[model samples]
Target: VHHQKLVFFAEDVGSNKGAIIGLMVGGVVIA
Candidate 1:
């Protein structure tokens, strides 16, 4: 539904130790 936002979501996250947490909180769970 929010594919565009997700691209930048990873863009902002980019494998940081907290990236998984961030994705979980955002509901994408890209982690």
Candidate 2:
């Protein structure tokens, strides 16, 4: 068996859209 590593990196110098979205919505899961 073999294993592989996953690297998720983006080089685009744009807005942090996902983090902002998560900050906006991730606080709603009050469970």
Candidate 3:
């Protein structure tokens, strides 16, 4: 099997944690 990688970005306004949290909350809810 081959491994694949992906890159992504988001606008956090300031906080680094904001970026991570925004993803989990936004992405998980959508899924």
**How far in Å is the alpha carbon of 6 misplaced in model 1?**
5.0
For residues 1-31, what per-residue lDDT tens digits would candidate 1 score against the true structure? 5434443453354456544331333445443
lDDT for 6 in candidate 1 is 42
lDDT by residue (1-31, candidate 3, tens digit) is 6533343456555544322332232333321
| Top TM-score model | 3
Native-referenced Cα lDDT, model 3: 0.37
lDDT of 3 at 14: 54
Write down the RMSD of candidate 1 (Cα, Å): 6.8
Query: How high is the CA lDDT of each candidate model?
Result: 0.40, 0.42, 0.37
Clashes of 3: 0
Clashes of each: 0, 0, 0
Model 2 misplaced regions, further than 4 Å: 6-31
